[PDB]
Design an enzyme around this catalytic site. Structure first.
Site, PDB file in Angstrom:
ATOM      1  N   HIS B  65      49.855  68.601 -29.269  1.00  0.00           N
ATOM      2  CA  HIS B  65      48.568  69.060 -28.736  1.00  0.00           C
ATOM      3  C   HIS B  65      47.560  67.914 -28.635  1.00  0.00           C
ATOM      4  O   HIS B  65      46.361  68.103 -28.846  1.00  0.00           O
ATOM      5  CB  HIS B  65      47.979  70.198 -29.575  1.00  0.00           C
ATOM      6  CG  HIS B  65      48.822  71.435 -29.621  1.00  0.00           C
ATOM      7  ND1 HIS B  65      48.460  72.604 -28.987  1.00  0.00           N
ATOM      8  CD2 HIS B  65      49.994  71.694 -30.247  1.00  0.00           C
ATOM      9  CE1 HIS B  65      49.378  73.526 -29.211  1.00  0.00           C
ATOM     10  NE2 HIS B  65      50.321  73.000 -29.972  1.00  0.00           N
ATOM     11  N   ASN B 138      48.275  79.907 -29.928  1.00  0.00           N
ATOM     12  CA  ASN B 138      48.637  79.446 -28.595  1.00  0.00           C
ATOM     13  C   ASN B 138      48.279  80.519 -27.572  1.00  0.00           C
ATOM     14  O   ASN B 138      47.921  81.647 -27.919  1.00  0.00           O
ATOM     15  CB  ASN B 138      50.134  79.106 -28.513  1.00  0.00           C
ATOM     16  CG  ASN B 138      50.477  77.789 -29.192  1.00  0.00           C
ATOM     17  OD1 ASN B 138      49.607  76.950 -29.424  1.00  0.00           O
ATOM     18  ND2 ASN B 138      51.753  77.603 -29.512  1.00  0.00           N
TER      19      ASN B 138
HETATM   20  C1  HEM Z   1      53.398  79.801 -34.101  1.00  0.00           C
HETATM   21  C2  HEM Z   1      53.659  78.489 -34.119  1.00  0.00           C
HETATM   22  C3  HEM Z   1      52.631  77.375 -33.785  1.00  0.00           C
HETATM   23  C4  HEM Z   1      51.415  77.454 -33.205  1.00  0.00           C
HETATM   24  C5  HEM Z   1      50.677  78.697 -32.655  1.00  0.00           C
HETATM   25  C6  HEM Z   1      50.863  76.115 -33.145  1.00  0.00           C
HETATM   26  C7  HEM Z   1      49.638  75.761 -32.617  1.00  0.00           C
HETATM   27  C8  HEM Z   1      49.042  74.522 -32.729  1.00  0.00           C
HETATM   28  C9  HEM Z   1      47.791  74.108 -32.128  1.00  0.00           C
HETATM   29  C10 HEM Z   1      46.880  74.984 -31.240  1.00  0.00           C
HETATM   30  C11 HEM Z   1      47.560  72.838 -32.479  1.00  0.00           C
HETATM   31  C12 HEM Z   1      46.351  71.980 -32.056  1.00  0.00           C
HETATM   32  C13 HEM Z   1      45.092  72.287 -32.855  1.00  0.00           C
HETATM   33  C14 HEM Z   1      44.003  71.418 -32.285  1.00  0.00           C
HETATM   34  O1  HEM Z   1      43.507  71.737 -31.175  1.00  0.00           O
HETATM   35  O2  HEM Z   1      43.648  70.397 -32.929  1.00  0.00           O
HETATM   36  C15 HEM Z   1      48.661  72.390 -33.310  1.00  0.00           C
HETATM   37  C16 HEM Z   1      48.803  71.142 -33.877  1.00  0.00           C
HETATM   38  C17 HEM Z   1      49.746  70.778 -34.819  1.00  0.00           C
HETATM   39  N1  HEM Z   1      50.853  71.527 -35.173  1.00  0.00           N
HETATM   40 FE1  HEM Z   1      51.334  73.377 -34.402  1.00  0.00          FE
HETATM   41  N2  HEM Z   1      51.775  75.246 -33.712  1.00  0.00           N
HETATM   42  C18 HEM Z   1      52.870  75.983 -34.122  1.00  0.00           C
HETATM   43  C19 HEM Z   1      53.994  75.468 -34.739  1.00  0.00           C
HETATM   44  C20 HEM Z   1      54.007  74.350 -35.550  1.00  0.00           C
HETATM   45  C21 HEM Z   1      54.975  74.023 -36.581  1.00  0.00           C
HETATM   46  C22 HEM Z   1      56.198  74.903 -36.932  1.00  0.00           C
HETATM   47  C23 HEM Z   1      54.621  72.846 -37.126  1.00  0.00           C
HETATM   48  C24 HEM Z   1      55.282  72.042 -38.274  1.00  0.00           C
HETATM   49  C25 HEM Z   1      56.064  72.587 -39.213  1.00  0.00           C
HETATM   50  C26 HEM Z   1      53.408  72.406 -36.471  1.00  0.00           C
HETATM   51  C27 HEM Z   1      52.720  71.244 -36.748  1.00  0.00           C
HETATM   52  C28 HEM Z   1      51.556  70.830 -36.136  1.00  0.00           C
HETATM   53  C29 HEM Z   1      50.853  69.590 -36.388  1.00  0.00           C
HETATM   54  C30 HEM Z   1      51.293  68.513 -37.403  1.00  0.00           C
HETATM   55  C31 HEM Z   1      49.769  69.555 -35.604  1.00  0.00           C
HETATM   56  C32 HEM Z   1      48.728  68.412 -35.547  1.00  0.00           C
HETATM   57  C33 HEM Z   1      47.375  68.942 -36.025  1.00  0.00           C
HETATM   58  C34 HEM Z   1      46.414  67.808 -36.277  1.00  0.00           C
HETATM   59  O3  HEM Z   1      46.816  66.626 -36.120  1.00  0.00           O
HETATM   60  O4  HEM Z   1      45.241  68.087 -36.639  1.00  0.00           O
HETATM   61  N3  HEM Z   1      53.069  73.340 -35.516  1.00  0.00           N
HETATM   62  N4  HEM Z   1      49.542  73.446 -33.442  1.00  0.00           N
END
Ligand code: HEM
Ligand code: HEM
Ligand code: HEM
Lengths: 679, 323, 682
Positions: B65, B138
């Site tokens: 993202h 999402n």
């Molecule tokens: C239902 C499943 C998921 C949804 C709805 C989702 C949604 C999101 C969203 C919207 C962001 C961006 C937030 C922003 O705008 O800063 C994000 C970032 C991120 N997500 Fe996911 N994600 C999912 C699954 C996962 C999984 C399974 C992992 C790891 C086990 C993961 C790890 C991360 C990481 C590391 C970031 C970076 C956030 C940051 O650097 O501040 N995500 N996710």
């Protein structure tokens, strides 16, 4: 193999079992849970070690030139140049030195489009036997500013607006043109960026420049001023803006894919290294100060003397470990080369070393495989984050009796040491000023504009017209006009039309009619058409596909990359109409029988967007490409109002079409299809 | 003003003299040189402090993202929901809570196009009087995988090939469709991403989903299973692919500019916060397991109950410091 | 050579010219200047690249155990232990595995004294052919707390006060004893730290403990509970506190120099690896919960079973790149070992992985030469700060048709993968509580105190007296007394005397008279006196030196390190009196003739501080060391009032003194020289 030294750090995972980063075989597709439908356990060390490494994959992008790509290669010296430099990599005929080159844009972030309009980087590292030597250059021989302390001002003004971070990878906004008009030194590089240099066809079709005047130093300390030049053996070639816009969306990776394919197919690109050599007493002899990075030295005063050739023939194996991690510095200098008092160069030496601390989060970035020299490192540096070595000498200081004087001092006379040019002197008051010799910001911009072809000149004006029309502030637009009018009254008048502003009165102080060689792109045909791409528009109905295959086979004999396009991926089809676009090709030819998809029901199919075959041919024609049609397919040309009378349009039998297209690819862009002011 | 708490860290440089970062007025348009055409001095502290800060401006982009944009706003509760949750920000009718929302794509890096085809992020923070509460969702109600340990595999396969870093912000390469067909759980989100959800008209024209089943808990500990829903009051709207491609080149900032323009012009977008509430003993009763994030609960089985509305009405002052 | 794998990253600078970090020979002793007396130029790339690396040399110290030192070595298994564990390094008799061990204190920062009173770290890495296996242990078998979430609270209270950062490397302040009395589980480790375990003679004279109950798992999944033990072949030995304080100032590197000296001189120290083994169904069968880290298992219930021996015989080449940069983890586990639901161990697994991101600032710290395994790394991890490899597999994900399934999954039956103990289950409500089986905080502290010798018990009470007397808050001292009273009424009363507080009334809920073996230090003489140090006090006048060197040669035959001390560095003198102190020696012997520097003219010299030879002999006696005098040097003993046939005092000819001193070195400390409560009564 240029990457030979990198073999010992390559990791082969074929046939291997999965492990943690500390050994021990594992499975890592299921989290450890407390019960069948239970929560994940904190003691799942396998999950956390796998996800921690993923969570920490990213490093900060380069503060400038974030978007780019690179490759390995070999430089070969053409002679023993000890009479002009002590540099070891130039010290014997046929001597070979591995290189890595990274090309790039400047403004955009990582993942911005290759075909944005921008200055382009051209950074070369020589892994010489006396240390790493970097020529950190651009595809444009001059830079925007005259003092390195102003670099944050230029970069902030060009990069997105800090409130909303708009726009990406573009100078077409208020703050950039506010800066260009408020800092008139920027007008020269501006004109180059508004020319074909801002939208090159590929990395392989760019010249390169060190920009700054440097010094070459012989063993006895005698020095000459020098400009570095890279001359592409593929020829310079540029797109048109309306084409680069669509290409930015259809394939943001156009340039990095172009370099990869050329190397993978054995068509390695080459550049000859050339120099302009100037005696020290002529630093201010040619109408400007050679310490001024906003001017270039016209080749009439000093011809290009080629010293060798560089060929890039090895793609990287891991993009991040090699291309993304490599750390260029103009301070990467070797014995036989020295700096000059170029105020822009002077500050670069500090910024590149310091910026590696942010990008690599530690002082040991030169120990990374892509940054390591081949010549050996022996000093008393110790510790630092990520220290990868184990030093034997426990007396890490000098002078010292206990280490027997080793590592030992090296200077001009002992140990092939680096040395500053012996004759360089300092004289005058400590000042925060620039020399009055830097004051002319208009003559050379006018010189560059005079030396382009008429349509080439119109491209420059249409770029300014496009960009300045995005400026919302009226006074900034007037400021831009007033500065353009100091370069040429006709340019200012022609730009003023698009802006709805009044044609200003001529200010002839810097007007002149002089021309110079070597700065135009469109006044020279290409020396080779190898790797150039031909899109063959065909159809799965009838016998069009078999003729397109024969057409493709003959085109490929001349080193062309041919893509047969049809409704679906039938036998012999390389791409569907749905995935195809004219931006991907240098020539568009319609196979015989394929006129059935340019009108009627053959043009209306669920398999591709409506009018896509006609759009591809229309795009290819209006963007100046060679366009063709075999036999009955001339109906396709007729369907878009194109006649075979025109230059760059070819019809008839297959052999006549192949010959015409192959000749048209040398012309590359047919400028007859672009209207000029008052034509 | 939703950003009212941020004013005490705002710095106004109008009508002021240039300074270093440690104070003292300066000029910083000329390096200090030893002579008229001389070399730059190491003692030019002005140059080095100004250039050091420039050299260190960048921080690592988000691992996923990375490309997105955000804005501040207000969430207003429609009722006292204490009978289903003890959450303070839902504890009274007309209760207001500041928010910040970031919309995004997933695969592309910082400078990639807004109109790439992708899953879209919809992350909301409620600055409640009992701590920050984030719904990191999402624009699609289901995800590719069923276990978080597989996330690096999914992301690696969709992001560019590690040998040449091609292609940017696209699933249309071999490795992504290798993973989709090798890990069949990914087919549901795949279909959503191949529909209009993959190429929305704007951030304001998307719905939002928490995807996961969560729990709402009352003061005495009674729990209900919950799915979070954001319902756009602007209506769902999507582009067509051949249009999104040209738009990727003609204006990579299409979506972030659209959000900025609507807020600046006084046309603040709104979403209603809605929930599906399921008894604990029916977690496996609707033809699937409610712990499975590759499934959504059809609304015919559990209609949406709307808890309040969120309105985004303030753009950030500094993108980097805030967004 | 245990360091053999590290030779590929070693850099030899001898016979070479100076270079930059990017190559090219240079000189770097003069800055580039604009004129003879001019300013330094920014274009001096040599100066900046040299000083930048200097400016960025330091990395954050360890959040705990910041002070320590280590060495390489070899571990040898004594048999094929496949009947109890599938661990590869224990799978065959005489199977050898390279190890690195780091010893440490806990509270003090990087430059604190080795001989502060503290728990001591004992961390061992096994570089097995199936991954790195770490036993991150201490020299004390029990820890302060029962749940890892309380670790920041324990550490904040022991570490210096956050307003002035006072005191360094010490528990003798208000906040530490406020925590010990508010969190009574800390009392057991407190008692151990207040004993000889808090002030050991050296790293080589410590036992080691994994503390936690772990699990040994066989190929078929059968498990047994296990406690790790390191038993020193040098024997346990400790100092006295009044000696450790002076040593902290006279030589803050006492322990790291001792280990370095012992290895350089060919006297590599050794420990035997021993285990206690408990059936799974007997986890709560020995009077406590074996998941409780505040308890040790008495050897009477489960004896030590030796599995092998570890010998440390190679010093590091660069301390920073090896000792400072090495990153231990209890999560460094291999096939054949598993965790238990010890709530302290559970949180450690998260903390050690996370804390490396702060110390090394990047996720690739396992690529550092000292952290790399010897077994090979193959996974789909990519990128990260400082990525040192170039991966060939471009299909960096699983599952995948394109990479043919490689790297492939490994589990219990395929590829010798790690597997959790198949019989482990979870049952009950998700809770933020502690098992009521953890409730007893006083029984085992009483058991430990019951099992020390009388003078050893006096050392514990005197340590508490010293520490608690530093507590300024009156109520905290009273809180400490109440808690001590629950362990032993007599202990609380003897401590209360020093604090001027009334003797508390008995609280006999947890009182008992049970004893256990293997926890005492002073009830057993040393099995060897090798490497032990002898300071021979001599003089440059007369013939004392020639006799002192004959004394040194005989002593050195028995493996002793002998220092001949005199007024100046004459021939045969190892150290001046100005540079000498009794803390550096295990025995002090006056050479014949040296009595002249103990009185009158010879004792007043500009070459050493006043009374220095008498102070060395006085300190050596008062600190319980074997002290001696040859021939006429008996006058030196009389000048400080020491009778010539006390225990541990040897007078006579050279052969007698050598005989007596070597025997006394086995006893090491002569405990009848320390008064016990009640001795001064009338
Ligand atoms: C239902 C499943 C998921 C949804 C709805 C989702 C949604 C999101 C969203 C919207 C962001 C961006 C937030 C922003 O705008 O800063 C994000 C970032 C991120 N997500 Fe996911 N994600 C999912 C699954 C996962 C999984 C399974 C992992 C790891 C086990 C993961 C790890 C991360 C990481 C590391 C970031 C970076 C956030 C940051 O650097 O501040 N995500 N996710
Ligand atoms: C003639 C003028 C200049 C030229 C030809 C030039 C060219 C380049 C090129 C090609 C790169 C990309 C290197 C790569 O591919 O990794 C780069 C990066 C960079 N440039 Fe310049 N530039 C110029 C002016 C400046 C100035 C005046 C400054 C600062 C005072 C500056 C600071 C930087 C920095 C900090 C980077 C990032 C390097 C990294 O992070 O590895 N540049 N420049
Ligand atoms: C039986 C209980 C414990 C034992 C035997 C123990 C032992 C050790 C030892 C010997 C070290 C130093 C390793 C070296 O020499 O580099 C260490 C470091 C450390 N310990 Fe513990 N400890 C215990 C409890 C805990 C707990 C409960 C936590 C946190 C929840 C913790 C967190 C840490 C951290 C963060 C480090 C720093 C490691 C590094 O920076 O590399 N410890 N421990």
């Amino acid at each position: 193999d240029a990457r030979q030294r990198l073999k010992e750090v390559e990791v082969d995972d074929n046939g291997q079992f999965m492990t943690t980063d500390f050994g021990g075989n594992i499975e890592e597709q299921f989290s450890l849970k407390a019960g069948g439908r239970g929560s994940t356990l904190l003691e799942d060390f396998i999950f956390r070690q796998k996800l921690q490494h993923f969570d920490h994959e990213r490093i900060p992008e380069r503060v400038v030139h974030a978007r780019g790509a690179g490759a390995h290669g070999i430089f070969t010296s053409y002679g023993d140049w000890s009479n002009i430099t002590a540099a070891s990599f130039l010290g014997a005929k046929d001597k070979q030195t591995p290189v890595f080159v990274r090309f790039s844009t400047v403004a955009g972030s990582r993942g911005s489009a290759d075909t944005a309009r921008d200055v382009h980087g051209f950074a070369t590292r020589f892994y010489t036997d006396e240390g790493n030597f970097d020529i950190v250059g651009n595809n444009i021989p001059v830079f925007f500013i005259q003092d390195a302390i102003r670099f944050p001002d230029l970069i902030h003004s060009v990069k997105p607006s800090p409130d909303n971070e708009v726009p990406q990878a573009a100078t077409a906004h208020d703050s950039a043109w506010d800066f260009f008009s408020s800092q008139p030194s920027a007008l020269h590089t501006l004109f180059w960026a508004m020319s074909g240099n801002g939208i090159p066809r590929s990395y392989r079709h760019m010249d390169g420049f060190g920009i700054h005047t440097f010094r070459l130093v012989t063993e006895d300390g005698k020095s000459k001023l020098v400009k570095w030049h890279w001359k592409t053996k593929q020829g310079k070639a540029a797109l048109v803006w309306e084409e680069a816009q669509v290409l930015a969306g259809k394939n943001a990776d156009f340039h990095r894919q172009d370099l990869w394919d050329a190397i993978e197919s054995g068509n390695a690109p080459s550049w000859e290294l050339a120099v302009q050599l100037i005696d020290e007493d002529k630093a201010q002899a040619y109408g400007f100060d050679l310490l001024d990075p906003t001017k270039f030295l016209p080749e009439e005063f000093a011809p290009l003397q080629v010293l060798g050739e560089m060929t890039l023939n090895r793609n990287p194996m891991n993009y991040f470990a090699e291309t993304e991690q490599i750390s260029f510095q103009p301070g990467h200098i070797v014995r036989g080369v020295d700096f000059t008092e170029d105020p822009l160069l002077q500050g670069r030496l500090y910024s590149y070393l310091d910026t590696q601390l942010n990008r690599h989060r530690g002082p040991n970035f030169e120990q990374l495989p892509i940054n390591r020299p081949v010549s050996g490192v022996h000093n008393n540096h110790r510790d630092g984050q990520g220290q990868a070595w184990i030093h034997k000498n426990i007396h890490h200081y000098s002078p010292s009796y206990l280490n027997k004087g080793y590592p030992a001092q090296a200077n001009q006379t002992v140990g092939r040491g680096f040395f500053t040019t012996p004759g360089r002197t300092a004289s005058g008051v400590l000042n925060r000023e620039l020399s009055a010799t830097f004051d002319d910001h208009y003559t050379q911009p006018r010189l560059f504009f005079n030396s382009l072809t008429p349509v080439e000149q119109q491209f420059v004006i249409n770029a300014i017209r496009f960009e300045a029309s995005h400026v919302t502030n009226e006074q900034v637009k007037k400021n831009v006009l007033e500065q353009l009018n100091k370069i040429s009254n006709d340019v200012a008048k022609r730009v003023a039309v698009a802006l709805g502003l009044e044609a200003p009165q001529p200010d002839p102080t810097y007007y002149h009619n002089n021309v110079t060689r070597g700065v135009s792109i469109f006044n020279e045909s290409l020396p080779t058409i190898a790797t150039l791409r031909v899109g063959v528009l065909s159809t799965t109905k009838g016998g069009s596909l078999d003729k397109a295959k024969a057409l493709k086979e003959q085109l490929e004999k001349d080193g062309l990359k041919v893509t047969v396009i049809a409704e679906y991926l039938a036998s012999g089809v390389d791409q569907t109409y749905s995935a195809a676009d004219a931006t991907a090709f240098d020539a568009v030819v319609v196979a015989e029988g394929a006129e059935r998809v340019f009108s009627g029901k053959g043009a209306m199919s669920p398999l591709f967007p409506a009018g896509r075959p006609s759009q591809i041919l229309t795009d290819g024609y209006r963007w100046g490409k060679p366009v063709a049609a075999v036999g009955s397919a001339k109906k396709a040309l007729q369907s878009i109002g194109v006649e075979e009378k025109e230059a760059g349009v070819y019809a008839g039998a297959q052999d006549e079409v192949i010959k015409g297209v192959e000749e048209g690819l040398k012309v590359f862009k047919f400028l007859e299809r672009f209207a000029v002011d008052g034509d």
